[PDB]
Amino acid sequence: NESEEERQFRKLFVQLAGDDMEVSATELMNILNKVVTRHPDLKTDGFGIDTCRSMVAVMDSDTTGKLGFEEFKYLWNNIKKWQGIYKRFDTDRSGTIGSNELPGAFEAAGFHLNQHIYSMIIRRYSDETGNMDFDNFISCLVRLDAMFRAFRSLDKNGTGQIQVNIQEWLQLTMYS
Amino acid sequence: AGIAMKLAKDREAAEGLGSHERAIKYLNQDYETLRNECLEAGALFQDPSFPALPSSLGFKELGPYSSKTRGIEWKRPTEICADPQFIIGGATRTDICQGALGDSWLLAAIASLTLNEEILARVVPLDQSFQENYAGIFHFQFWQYGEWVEVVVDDRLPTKDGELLFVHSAEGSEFWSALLEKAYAKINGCYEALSGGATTEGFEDFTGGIAEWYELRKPPPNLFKIIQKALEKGSLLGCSIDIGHAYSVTGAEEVQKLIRIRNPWGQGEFWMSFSDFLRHYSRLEICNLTPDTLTCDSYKKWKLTKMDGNWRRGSTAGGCRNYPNTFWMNPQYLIKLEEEDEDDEDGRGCTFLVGLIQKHRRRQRKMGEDMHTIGFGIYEVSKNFFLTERSDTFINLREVLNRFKLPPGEYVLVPSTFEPHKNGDFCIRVFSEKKADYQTVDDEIEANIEEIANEEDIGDGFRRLFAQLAGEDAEISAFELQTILRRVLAKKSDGFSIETCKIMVDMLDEDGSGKLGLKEFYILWTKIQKYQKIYREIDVDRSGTMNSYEMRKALEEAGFKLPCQLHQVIVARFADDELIIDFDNFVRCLVRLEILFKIFKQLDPENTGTIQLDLISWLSFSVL
């Protein structure tokens, strides 16, 4: 079954929503920021409400703005893996990851794109100096993962392509 | 997870997935595939998803630690009798019965499947047995809130001292009934979940039809006509005396008025005056079959329609006139009755049945529990404004059904919860004498955005202050943008978030630089003025904010009309708890919504409504 980090988590869920076992985006925020931001080997103020809302959004296929526990376990897992990666690259523990290392970071993450997408991603999620922080690194990975998966989902047979109508599109990109 | 899961499911359904002939595979287990594996590996199937342990029994009344589960030994049929049979043909009666554990409403609902072969097959595959390709595995088909779901189970039945503790044949030889009940418990989480059941739900879940029920102490008029017309449609009628034997109505004639009663436990029947029927029994349950259920040449069937929808706190959860402020916000449907019911006695009209069943929710632990108080109103005659023939009937049942005979025309159906602000899903079905037309009544997708034409004009001061702000490149960044607007709006909500500003830039750039020029800053400023107006004119009580429910209004003013689903999406994603949408999110949504349309339009040159993307292009547009 599940594990010690999870049951401890399941705990917080029960107390918060009994048999509903779902969490709000702001509830999610409080939880994770009691866990990720509190360690001397990772400089971060934690995740922000917008980062959390996007987490709930990409993980919630019922349109209720509530994150389910099974979904949260999946998410946490990814967050722990990407957590390790962020440490491997925040060398001076500066709080961010240099603009030149990021491409290798996303690649250590399994996401193989091209120098242009990162020259789109970096520019889109970094601060003005060109560097990304823990919050944004995670935030960006959640979506890359979300959209990788959606693509697989709408491509049952494995044709390297998907077709979508205006309705499917607005849902796929609005709720994220 | 993700709406892409739902979007794939919808697609599958649109092609038959969920129909009786292509039943959804519960927990993805595929009967054959699992069977054949147990054969090759020469073993007897054991269900991973619904193991033979206490958890498959209960959690409270029948939970571990409880002295009711102490002693139970799961055993297969082959070990409880010397040649167990799945089903014995040539039956003229049934001998089903319960064990020490196991509800009685099951006898009733299960016994009713013994009267018609065709109705039993539908829910109990006939090509099964303990002889042929046996491997300790059986499947069954149940109807679930609209679609069919195939379930699998290993034949391990709970026993306590060589005696089934639930549903079993009296002669202890047949086993389909015991298995059908095991399966039904699985798809319900556990045997204990069946404790709070009701024959009407069983009838539905076992056949896929709609069930009218009548307390005989307050019968509707022309009941005898209803019964007679149901029997003609091959409907399943059952009656009883409740406060314990379930009988069925198998005949009704005028020669006086007579209804024939049959005991599924005898092989015999008998007639009685309609008068006695009305006085002896206390409940009549009519299970009205869908038109595909029976194939027996001409048995005369109903015409069926069914739709799906939901209610979501903050956007679509109003319901019940009593709440005029939100009522018009629930989903809305339209029924079109043409040909009337044929002659006989009473006046004219079109007969039809309407049922609204609320789908399963996470916290439902046992059947019949934590059910929402539902109901629906009907009105005689885009998405209808607060400017909106029966209605009423609001109970907390998993389904509310009303029978009607109305003059041919168009009516508007408004399903809803009693109180507003409650999340739940649902399915509506309409059974009718003659062909009727269903149709959703909602806003079609539309975006009509005002295209400002910057051009000359643009002031002297404006231009000057800009230059003294744009730096060497005469352009600013999303970061500089934030700070510039923060100062301005500082003098409602206190500042645009940095994500808001970045998407602004992605929208107005077009110069492909990551920065906004003078003309591009001008347009933004213009659009930023509009938003400020709209937001202001909605906040009629100057509170500095807006409420989730006003969004539909606001979107329309910004040039947008969207379907209920997208409105749910928008409030779920941008409104905070306590359904309030601040100004930053307010414009975030508008900018985002506009950019998403422009992009679709660019990727759809032919203007076809659908775009074809590959993996790499898909990631680029999904997140940039």
Side-chain angles (χ1 to χ4, degrees), chain A, chain B residues 1-242 244-254 257-266 268-347 349-384 388 392-453 458-624:
Chain A
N1 68 151
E2 50 191 60
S3 72
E4 182 65 11
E5 205 157 50
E6 299 172 329
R7 48 77 71 168
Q8 197 65 60
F9 264 148
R10 172 180 292 274
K11 171 173 161 53
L12 296 173
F13 269 54
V14 156
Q15 169 178 173
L16 295 184
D19 314 20
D20 284 325
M21 294 305 278
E22 301 175 318
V23 144
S24 172
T26 120
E27 278 155 357
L28 176 57
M29 188 189 85
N30 276 272
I31 293 165
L32 295 178
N33 287 345
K34 294 166 75 69
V35 167
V36 296
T37 175
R38 225 50 161 175
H39 298 170
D41 58 315
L42 203 301
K43 197 73 212 306
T44 192
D45 287 340
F47 307 107
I49 196 59
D50 186 73
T51 293
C52 291
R53 285 182 186 147
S54 191
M55 300 190 269
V56 168
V58 304
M59 286 299 266
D60 155 53
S61 59
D62 278 333
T63 323
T64 76
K66 289 280 192 174
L67 166 58
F69 189 69
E70 284 306 297
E71 292 73 25
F72 169 96
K73 282 184 297 165
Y74 186 94
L75 177 79
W76 179 245
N77 208 52
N78 282 331
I79 292 181
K80 203 165 66 174
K81 161 179 176 165
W82 307 328
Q83 199 177 202
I85 300 187
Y86 179 83
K87 283 165 192 163
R88 184 98 188 307
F89 294 72
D90 185 15
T91 284
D92 55 359
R93 272 113 44 70
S94 60
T96 78
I97 291 182
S99 197
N100 281 62
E101 297 76 69
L102 296 164
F106 285 95
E107 223 142 359
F111 300 107
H112 26 288
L113 293 326
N114 60 49
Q115 300 316 298
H116 181 303
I117 311 290
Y118 300 106
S119 293
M120 192 150 45
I121 301 184
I122 297 308
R123 232 55 194 159
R124 170 68 208 201
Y125 302 84
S126 317
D127 45 54
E128 33 182 354
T129 70
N131 303 159
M132 209 177 295
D133 69 356
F134 184 48
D135 185 12
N136 282 278
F137 184 63
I138 293 305
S139 162
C140 186
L141 287 167
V142 180
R143 306 198 59 245
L144 248 351
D145 184 54
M147 310 291 92
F148 183 58
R149 309 192 281 112
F151 188 89
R152 300 308 291 304
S153 292
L154 309 166
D155 182 21
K156 52 149 84 170
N157 317 323
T159 321
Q161 305 189 301
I162 78 179
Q163 318 177 299
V164 299
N165 60 47
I166 187 54
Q167 174 120 313
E168 304 178 303
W169 169 257
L170 295 172
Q171 295 194 85
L172 290 168
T173 73
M174 265 290 125
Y175 206 37
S176 46
Chain B
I3 37 98
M5 191 169 69
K6 178 162 59 188
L7 270 22
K9 169 55 174 309
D10 297 342
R11 294 187 188 202
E12 291 305 348
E15 297 190 295
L17 198 271
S19 62
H20 180 276
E21 316 117 63
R22 179 117 80 62
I24 292 181
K25 266 67 170 61
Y26 189 49
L27 270 27
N28 297 70
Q29 320 187 67
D30 179 66
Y31 177 75
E32 261 195 303
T33 295
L34 291 188
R35 193 195 51 180
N36 289 194
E37 275 161 32
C38 289
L39 282 177
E40 293 239 3
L44 288 181
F45 183 87
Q46 319 195 200
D47 201 8
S49 53
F50 193 61
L53 299 157
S55 53
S56 276
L57 285 170
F59 52 75
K60 213 297 187 195
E61 226 63 6
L62 276 52
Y65 295 32
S66 160
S67 43
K68 278 173 149 293
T69 61
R70 209 149 303 170
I72 294 172
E73 291 182 56
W74 290 71
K75 306 190 171 184
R76 303 175 180 261
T78 50
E79 302 154 46
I80 171 190
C81 100
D83 187 356
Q85 226 71 209
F86 190 46
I87 174 184
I88 305 299
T92 52
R93 50 167 304 214
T94 180
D95 63 355
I96 301 305
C97 54
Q98 264 299 337
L101 291 45
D103 269 66
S104 67
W105 67 268
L106 266 175
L107 288 312
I110 299 185
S112 343
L113 301 171
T114 71
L115 306 190
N116 188 332
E117 167 204 300
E118 290 201 356
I119 291 184
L120 185 60
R122 302 271 296 183
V123 46
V124 170
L126 288 299
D127 319 318
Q128 290 182 292
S129 42
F130 284 98
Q131 289 88 292
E132 282 305 285
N133 313 77
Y134 169 75
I137 189 182
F138 297 90
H139 59 319
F140 300 92
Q141 307 175 59
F142 296 116
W143 177 91
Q144 296 283 278
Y145 317 85
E147 62 196 358
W148 288 95
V149 174
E150 190 171 338
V151 182
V152 167
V153 292
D154 55 76
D155 66 21
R156 263 138 56 202
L157 296 161
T159 69
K160 179 169 295 182
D161 298 313
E163 310 189 66
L164 296 325
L165 291 169
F166 298 103
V167 168
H168 53 88
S169 133
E171 189 62 43
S173 183
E174 255 183 333
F175 292 86
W176 67 271
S177 57
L179 274 11
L180 164 41
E181 186 202 17
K182 213 274 194 84
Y184 197 53
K186 183 181 180 193
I187 203 164
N188 265 83
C190 66
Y191 277 98
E192 184 169 7
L194 264 31
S195 186
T199 59
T200 73
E201 298 153 8
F203 264 127
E204 276 170 353
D205 300 339
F206 294 172
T207 62
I210 186 40
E212 324 178 53
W213 51 278
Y214 293 105
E215 286 283 75
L216 271 38
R217 298 236 319 186
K218 64 165 292 199
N222 62 305
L223 208 195
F224 189 86
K225 194 168 60 177
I226 287 161
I227 296 176
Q228 188 165 279
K229 293 178 77 180
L231 283 176
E232 305 194 6
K233 303 252 193 53
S235 286
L236 286 171
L237 299 63
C239 43
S240 58
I241 315 155
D242 308 300
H245 203 67
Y247 301 83
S248 70
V249 174
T250 69
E253 273 187 344
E254 326 188 38
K257 218 79 76 60
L258 212 169
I259 54 87
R260 182 165 64 187
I261 296 305
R262 186 283 168 61
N263 179 163
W265 279 269
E269 306 171 291
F270 57 82
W271 298 77
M272 77 195 281
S273 73
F274 181 47
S275 334
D276 272 309
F277 171 90
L278 264 38
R279 316 158 62 195
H280 184 62
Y281 300 83
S282 69
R283 249 242 189 173
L284 181 265
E285 299 180 321
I286 313 181
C287 185
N288 300 92
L289 274 29
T290 65
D292 48 326
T293 304
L294 299 169
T295 58
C296 188
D297 37 5
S298 289
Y299 228 117
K300 189 36 56 184
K301 46 253 299 196
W302 304 87
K303 303 302 174 298
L304 174 58
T305 276
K306 78 110 162 306
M307 317 85 66
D308 294 85
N310 34 260
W311 307 297
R312 289 293 183 279
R313 179 181 151 93
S315 62
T316 66
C320 203
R321 134 46 92 91
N322 299 189
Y323 304 104
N325 296 172
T326 61
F327 182 77
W328 68 285
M329 304 185 87
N330 305 293
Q332 301 156 182
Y333 308 73
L334 169 294
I335 317 295
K336 186 190 180 69
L337 298 314
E338 28 162 284
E339 189 168 12
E340 314 185 13
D341 277 46
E342 279 155 353
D343 308 308
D344 66 310
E345 140 235 64
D346 178 278
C350 296
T351 290
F352 70 84
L353 279 160
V354 174
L356 175 72
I357 183 186
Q358 65 200 85
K359 298 164 170 176
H360 178 82
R361 304 217 304 295
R362 322 309 139 192
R363 67 126 72 73
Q364 319 262 218
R365 281 283 228 165
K366 173 184 300 176
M367 279 176 92
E369 277 175 48
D370 317 290
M371 207 74 71
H372 277 145
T373 287
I374 40 172
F376 60 97
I378 283 195
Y379 296 70
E380 319 189 14
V381 307
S382 314
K383 195 274 182 330
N384 307 168
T388 319
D392 270 347
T393 67
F394 272 82
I395 48 298
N396 53 338
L397 293 183
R398 73 117 100 127
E399 190 186 51
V400 281
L401 179 294
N402 270 316
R403 180 162 191 128
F404 301 89
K405 187 161 183 172
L406 309 173
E410 300 171 359
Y411 302 80
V412 153
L413 216 311
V414 176
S416 109
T417 267
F418 179 76
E419 303 194 70
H421 317 156
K422 291 186 149 53
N423 294 185
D425 295 6
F426 62 72
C427 173
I428 292 189
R429 297 133 82 209
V430 174
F431 289 75
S432 66
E433 264 304 307
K434 267 68 164 47
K435 268 293 186 61
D437 281 359
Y438 97 89
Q439 184 152 302
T440 205
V441 60
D442 212 353
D443 297 339
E444 287 277 3
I445 287 160
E446 202 169 72
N448 271 296
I449 306 81
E450 307 182 3
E451 280 303 67
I452 336 73
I458 288 192
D460 194 78
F462 196 100
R463 293 165 164 289
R464 294 190 164 198
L465 242 36
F466 185 60
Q468 291 290 300
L469 198 57
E472 282 202 308
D473 57 8
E475 293 202 356
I476 56 181
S477 80
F479 281 94
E480 295 168 310
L481 180 62
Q482 174 186 310
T483 187
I484 290 167
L485 279 33
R486 175 182 129 283
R487 289 166 154 65
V488 193
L489 322 184
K491 300 176 173 180
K492 306 176 177 186
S493 289
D494 308 300
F496 279 134
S497 66
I498 173 69
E499 292 72 15
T500 295
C501 297
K502 291 193 161 186
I503 43 168
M504 288 172 169
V505 166
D506 286 331
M507 181 169 73
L508 284 315
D509 205 294
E510 287 167 52
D511 68 281
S513 70
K515 298 185 70 165
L516 300 176
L518 176 277
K519 172 165 172 294
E520 314 177 312
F521 180 58
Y522 182 74
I523 305 186
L524 169 63
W525 184 271
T526 299
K527 292 180 180 263
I528 290 186
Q529 279 175 307
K530 239 233 297 175
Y531 306 157
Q532 299 181 88
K533 191 201 85 316
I534 284 185
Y535 200 70
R536 209 185 314 149
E537 298 173 356
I538 302 289
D539 180 357
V540 188
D541 37 295
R542 289 297 293 195
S543 183
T545 65
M546 178 193 263
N547 169 295
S548 299
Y549 293 102
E550 330 235 63
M551 257 318 286
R552 177 189 293 274
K553 199 196 327 307
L555 288 175
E556 198 178 4
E557 289 293 284
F560 304 112
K561 279 173 300 181
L562 307 150
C564 289
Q565 165 75 287
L566 299 169
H567 285 269
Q568 283 165 168
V569 165
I570 280 173
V571 51
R573 171 70 169 90
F574 302 109
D576 73 327
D577 296 351
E578 133 202 300
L579 306 322
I580 147 185
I581 295 181
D582 66 5
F583 195 61
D584 176 68
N585 289 313
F586 172 76
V587 353
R588 162 94 73 103
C589 181
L590 293 165
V591 179
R592 195 151 148 189
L593 191 45
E594 176 175 353
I595 302 139
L596 264 4
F597 274 106
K598 295 296 221 298
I599 295 184
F600 196 94
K601 294 164 190 287
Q602 192 181 293
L603 301 171
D604 189 10
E606 290 284 43
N607 205 192
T608 68
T610 48
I611 59 190
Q612 178 153 64
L613 288 188
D614 77 1
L615 176 55
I616 326 74
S617 310
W618 170 261
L619 292 180
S620 339
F621 290 124
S622 295
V623 284
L624 302 155

